[PDB]
Amino acid sequence: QATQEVKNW
Amino acid sequence: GSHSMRYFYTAMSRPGRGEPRFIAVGYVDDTQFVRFDSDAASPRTEPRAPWIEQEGPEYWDGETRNMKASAQTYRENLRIALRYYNQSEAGSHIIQRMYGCDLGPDGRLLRGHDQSAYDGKDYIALNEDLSSWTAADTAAQITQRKWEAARVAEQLRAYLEGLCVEWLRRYLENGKETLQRADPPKTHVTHHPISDHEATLRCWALGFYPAEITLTWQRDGEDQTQDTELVETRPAGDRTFQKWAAVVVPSGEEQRYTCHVQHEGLPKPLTLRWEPH
Amino acid sequence: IQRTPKIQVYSRHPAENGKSNFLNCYVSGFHPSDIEVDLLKNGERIEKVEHSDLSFSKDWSFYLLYYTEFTPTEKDEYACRVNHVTLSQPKIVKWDRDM
């Protein structure tokens, strides 16, 4: 299962 | 032996050719098991290994939901990167991320990874402690501050400690018959004359899994590291890999060379010589 | 900022004429991602060719595998042709059973 992000650079 | 799960994301901008494209793949060891392509006619997180297909509706909806969000998030990261680097909107740029969990033979979490790059160079990485970041340049520092401020590292460590390890153990169980079996290589040494005076010996390894292998040429028991030509370990297409190493030798010296192969599937490393019949 | 692809043309199983096999072109270690690969028989592209999903290595360079079902013949000569921002002309690598 992938990781939810949701951070922006 | 020891098992790992990794996810690979790629985001590319295509100014004047369309929206930025986002591609994601997942692997367990060297076996890819999922895919997402923003360019597909109807983008979806699709299975690429049979053992994953058993996963339920909540799962597949969940990851498609996730991957479509991530594509938006990286479309915006691509724009943000333009500010940090003062780059034009005409160029085409690429953001990559690879992250995953390593499990020791023991099966508890042994290491966690997260690394990101811009235009093929290092950008930011999660350190070994899973609490701090390493920035590659002043631009990545801008991101670094935002992420320690938003405590991202605590959130990714929660993922690798728990959900990554837990799914990867579940996958290893579901994919027991392929993921947990080592295929030793099939090996043979090949000879081709360049001339009457010189020939090429090539050592072959075929059909092995996992991809990790070492091929070595030795002359009178000493390493021909510098004179060996190695190719990148390559996929066969049936989930096994291949590799070869070759040297140019003077005619009549062929039996002083021995090829040494190391693979996890092998009990003891193999020593091969050219055997013509 | 740019790395040229390394190309390998090979068969999935050792070649024996008249016996069905797979023709693989593996391109690796290249940057950026925009690449085009076609598989050639007698200098002309084979119609149905598929490729792996894009992925990359530890050093961030990409790799793909292009494959098709084929039957080798004494007569015919097969190849792989690759185009990339680093290549001045499309680079063609002819298949040698020995490699």
Side-chain angles (χ1 to χ4, degrees), chain B residues 10 33 120:
Chain B
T10 320
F33 70 99

Side-chain angles (χ1 to χ4, degrees), chain C residues 5-94:
Chain C
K6 316 200 71 188
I7 296 146
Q8 292 187 73
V9 191
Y10 54 107
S11 39
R12 183 194 281 186
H13 304 282
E16 204 207 319
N17 299 341
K19 200 288 169 209
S20 203
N21 201 329
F22 276 82
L23 182 56
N24 294 317
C25 192
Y26 181 64
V27 291
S28 63
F30 57 97
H31 219 279
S33 57
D34 187 33
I35 192 167
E36 266 155 36
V37 176
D38 301 313
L39 292 175
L40 316 179
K41 177 177 197 198
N42 285 324
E44 289 183 18
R45 19 198 298 194
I46 297 138
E47 165 170 14
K48 312 198 188 178
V49 177
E50 298 182 293
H51 62 18
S52 64
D53 306 318
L54 180 74
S55 190
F56 50 85
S57 294
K58 320 66 187 173
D59 71 349
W60 307 108
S61 49
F62 299 109
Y63 60 79
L64 308 155
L65 168 81
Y66 286 76
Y67 54 92
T68 191
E69 303 92 276
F70 84 135
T71 292
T73 59
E74 144 71 341
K75 147 193 41 163
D76 277 284
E77 177 141 51
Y78 298 84
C80 182
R81 157 200 84 184
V82 186
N83 203 12
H84 186 248
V85 77
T86 57
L87 304 173
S88 212
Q89 287 229 299
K91 138 172 283 200
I92 294 166
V93 184
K94 310 187 199 152

Side-chain angles (χ1 to χ4, degrees), chain A residues 1, chain B residues 54-66 167:
Chain A
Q1 213 196 42
Chain B
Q54 34 194 302
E55 288 303 335
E58 174 179 325
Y59 177 91
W60 296 107
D61 169 83
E63 318 305 289
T64 303
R65 199 170 293 272
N66 191 14
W167 280 98

Side-chain angles (χ1 to χ4, degrees), chain B residues 70-171:
Chain B
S70 297
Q72 209 46 59
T73 297
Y74 280 99
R75 280 195 248 280
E76 186 44 27
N77 293 349
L78 280 166
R79 291 190 278 252
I80 295 166
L82 293 173
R83 298 197 240 115
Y84 296 1
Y85 290 105
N86 290 307
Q87 295 174 323
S88 154
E89 309 157 57
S92 190
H93 306 262
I94 300 191
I95 294 190
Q96 286 163 102
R97 174 176 185 231
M98 62 187 161
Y99 67 89
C101 340
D102 287 3
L103 253 57
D106 160 25
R108 319 133 200 267
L109 166 65
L110 193 128
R111 166 161 210 195
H113 294 266
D114 185 306
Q115 297 160 247
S116 296
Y118 191 57
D119 279 341
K121 196 36 206 161
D122 276 307
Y123 181 76
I124 198 167
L126 181 75
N127 290 334
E128 182 81 325
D129 51 36
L130 302 188
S131 317
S132 87
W133 305 93
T134 306
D137 53 51
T138 70
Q141 303 194 335
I142 300 172
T143 297
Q144 188 189 335
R145 295 161 140 118
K146 281 180 198 180
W147 285 9
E148 33 174 271
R151 321 191 335 182
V152 179
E154 310 203 352
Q155 291 217 338
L156 301 169
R157 178 244 297 168
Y159 167 79
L160 304 127
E161 216 169 27
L163 272 195
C164 172
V165 170
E166 285 300 330
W167 280 98
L168 159 67
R169 293 193 272 211
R170 162 180 180 92
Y171 296 154

Side-chain angles (χ1 to χ4, degrees), chain B residues 168-217:
Chain B
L168 159 67
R169 293 193 272 211
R170 162 180 180 92
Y171 296 154
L172 284 166
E173 179 64 26
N174 289 347
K176 205 186 150 256
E177 313 285 29
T178 42
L179 299 174
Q180 295 194 53
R181 190 184 106 107
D183 288 331
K186 309 147 158 229
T187 47
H188 59 270
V189 173
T190 295
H191 181 267
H192 324 276
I194 294 164
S195 82
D196 297 296
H197 307 300
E198 315 206 279
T200 301
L201 301 164
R202 173 168 305 106
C203 190
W204 286 86
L206 309 163
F208 55 96
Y209 178 90
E212 172 69 39
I213 193 161
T214 314
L215 293 193
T216 314
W217 270 114

